[PDB]
Amino acid sequence: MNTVPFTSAPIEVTIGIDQYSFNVKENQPFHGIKDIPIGHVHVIHFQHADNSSMRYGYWFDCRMGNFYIQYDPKDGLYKMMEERDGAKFENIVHNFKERQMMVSYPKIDEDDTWYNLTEFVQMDKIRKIVRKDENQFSYVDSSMTTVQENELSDPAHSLNYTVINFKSREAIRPGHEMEDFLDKSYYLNTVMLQGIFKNSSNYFGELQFAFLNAMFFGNYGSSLQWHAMIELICSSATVPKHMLDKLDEILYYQIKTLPEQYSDILLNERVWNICLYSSFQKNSLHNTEKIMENKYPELL
Amino acid sequence: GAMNSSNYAELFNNDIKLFVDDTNVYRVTVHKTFEGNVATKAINGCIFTLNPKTGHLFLKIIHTSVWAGQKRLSQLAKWKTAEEVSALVRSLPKEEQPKQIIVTRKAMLDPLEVHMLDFPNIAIRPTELRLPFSAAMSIDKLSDVVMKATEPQMVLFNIYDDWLDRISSYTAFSRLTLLLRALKTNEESAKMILLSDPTITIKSYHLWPSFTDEQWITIESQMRDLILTEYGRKYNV
Ligand SMILES: COC(=O)CN(C)C(=O)/C=C/c1ccsc1
Numbered sequence: 089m090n091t092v093p094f095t096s097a098p099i100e101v102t103i104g105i106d107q108y109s110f111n112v113k114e115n116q117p118f119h120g121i122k123d124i125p126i127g128h129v130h131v132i133h134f135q136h137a138d139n140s141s142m143r144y145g146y147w148f149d150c151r152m153g154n155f156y157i158q159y160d161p162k163d164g165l166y167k168m169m170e171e172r173d174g175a176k177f178e179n180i181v182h183n184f185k186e187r188q189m190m191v192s193y194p195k196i197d198e199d200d201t202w203y204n205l206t207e208f209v210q211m212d213k214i215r216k217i218v219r220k221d222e223n224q225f226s227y228v229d230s231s232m233t234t235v236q237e238n239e240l241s242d243p244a245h246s247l248n249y250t251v252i253n254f255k256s257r258e259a260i261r262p263g264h265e266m267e268d269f270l271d272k273s274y275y276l277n278t279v280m281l282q283g284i285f286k287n288s289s290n291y292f293g294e295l296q297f298a299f300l301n302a303m304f305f306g307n308y309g310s311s312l313q314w315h316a317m318i319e320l321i322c323s324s325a326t327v328p329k330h331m332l333d334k335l336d337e338i339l340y341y342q343i344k345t346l347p348e349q350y351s352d353i354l355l356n357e358r359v360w361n362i363c364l365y366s367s368f369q370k371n372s373l374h375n376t377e378k379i380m381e382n383k384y385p386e387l388l
Numbered sequence: 389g390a391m392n393s394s395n396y397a398e399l400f401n402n403d404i405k406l407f408v409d410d411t412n413v414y415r416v417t418v419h420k421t422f423e424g425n426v427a428t429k430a431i432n433g434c435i436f437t438l439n440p441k442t443g444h445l446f447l448k449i450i451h452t453s454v455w456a457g458q459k460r461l462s463q464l465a466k467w468k469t470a471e472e473v474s475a476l477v478r479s480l481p482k483e484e485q486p487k488q489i490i491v492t493r494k495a496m497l498d499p500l501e502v503h504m505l506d507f508p509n510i511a512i513r514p515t516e517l518r519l520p521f522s523a524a525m526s527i528d529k530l531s532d533v534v535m536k537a538t539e540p541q542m543v544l545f546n547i548y549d550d551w552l553d554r555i556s557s558y559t560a561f562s563r564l565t566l567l568l569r570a571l572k573t574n575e576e577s578a579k580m581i582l583l584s585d586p587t588i589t590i591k592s593y594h595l596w597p598s599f600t601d602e603q604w605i606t607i608e609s610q611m612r613d614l615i616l617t618e619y620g621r622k623y624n625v
């Protein structure tokens with residue numbers, strides 16, 4: 089179990105760790121988060137009490153280094169940083185735990201929610217999306233735009249998601265215009281899964297990473313990307329059975345975890361109705377369709 | 389964006405454009421089978437592709453053989469239309485390729501956009517106008533060449549005959565649409581109007597009769613009366 093210590097908490101802020109969150113008052117004696125499960129990526133994220141604009145945060149993996157948070161009063165935000173001095177870090181953390189100034193990552197033992205949301209999200213793969221190679225952790229916020237969004241403006245601060253575009257030469261083989269547009273199996277299986285992604289696990293990870301940035305930061309381009317990667321599979325007539333089964337599980341937990349009050353902006357009515365009711369895979373998403381109909385029947 | 393009453397004059401400026409109408413591409417008769425079921429029998433059709441500035445009409449005849457052994461024909465018809473329009477553009481010299489293609493029905497936008505991905509600088513647009521181009525199979529010489537075809541075939545037609553020698557494209561298009569609207573609302577009456585007088589003939593290389601200016605005005609009036617009429621007969625007004 090790993091620890092992300094905080095130097096201090098000078099401004100009132102709501103702190104998230106994965107799907108948990110807690111309020112820290114201005115200059116409250118708070119020095120971090122302890123008992124973080126090893127083996128998963130994690131996101132630690134922030135919304136200032138003053139300016140609910142800009143949710144922001146840090147993707148990280150505690151196996152990749154010792155990380156802490158420190159408020160920067162010039163840039164005005166909580167910054168993740170890496171401590172290279174191992175003995176200095178253990179010494180810092182042990183003192184803060186002795187004085188009990190840390191919140192415990194509160195995992196219930198029956199609960200596989202985080203694993204289920206992150207099964208295929210790696211930290212090294214996450215670095216391909218967020219280019220800032222000098223850090224082992226990745227910064228994301230509400231307003232960052234995607235590579236495809238800039239095509240339609242700062243490239244250093246972009247989300248490099250896989251560009252998916254159903255009306256593109258990449259998606260459409262010359263001479264198969266109708267076939268490829270109505271049955272996207274060629275674009276799923278050859279272009280994306282065999283050409284850019286290699287296996288069906290990498291494909292799922294980008295899709296999962298897209299969802300979590302949408303949910304935690306309200307990042308709109310990530311929401312577009314999630315729905316695109318779902319639609320590409322639902323609109324393919326030929327999808328390996330194992331990928332469909334896994335897809336239904338993936339989506340099931342995404343829908344389960346989504347804040348009830350955010351469904352109106354995070355869920356695309358058109359994509360979901362098409363996927364569940366019209367697409368080739370309309371009968372292949374039993375768990376996802378059951379939870380969507382019981383929890384968000386309005387959308388449908 | 390879309391084409392409507394407010395930007396109507398763009399049709400007659402000097403940027404090449406084509407209207408594409410797919411209404412008559414897939415045509416069937418419906419009939420009863422010996423077992424008392426219903427079956428369709430396809431008949432020949434046509435794509436109506438028109439330069440509104442020049443009158444130049446590229447009439448691609450859709451021979452019934454293209455449907456043989458195919459499913460979901462109404463949907464295939466839109467993709468076949470898009471494929472043939474795309475082939476047409478690619479066959480034209482660059483300086484003759486359109487800068488815009490305006491589709492008369494919105495279901496053609498995606499089929500055509502996908503077939504024209506190689507031409508990113510050609511704009512594919514819908515329209516809010518209810519253009520009567522479905523009535524082009526009421527023009528005897530066009531209907532005749534579609535029904536006689538035994539194979540796929542492209543026939544070039546000038547839908548304005550020689551009118552541009554005497555009138556502007558704006559007026560020529562307005563005459564054409566008035567004639568097509570009448571033929572669509574009441575074909576027999578409209579055809580009666582056009583041909584009542586045996587002394588006015590249709591030249592062998594024309595579609596419509598050789599009316600003088602004064603006669604076209606009378607004709608145009610009669611078509612407007614017909615259209616207002618049928619609208620009463622229809623709505624009881
Ligand atoms: C430049 O594009 C990429 O790097 C996308 N590909 C092809 C991946 O495999 C990434 C998967 C992934 C992303 C977050 S968690 C997993």
Ligand SMILES: COC(=O)CN(C)C(=O)/C=C/c1ccsc1
Nearest residue numbers: 444445446544545546549550593
């Ligand atoms: C004057 O009456 C005519 O019939 C003359 N036309 C046919 C033309 O000059 C060319 C038409 C055309 C060209 C490409 S597609 C149609």
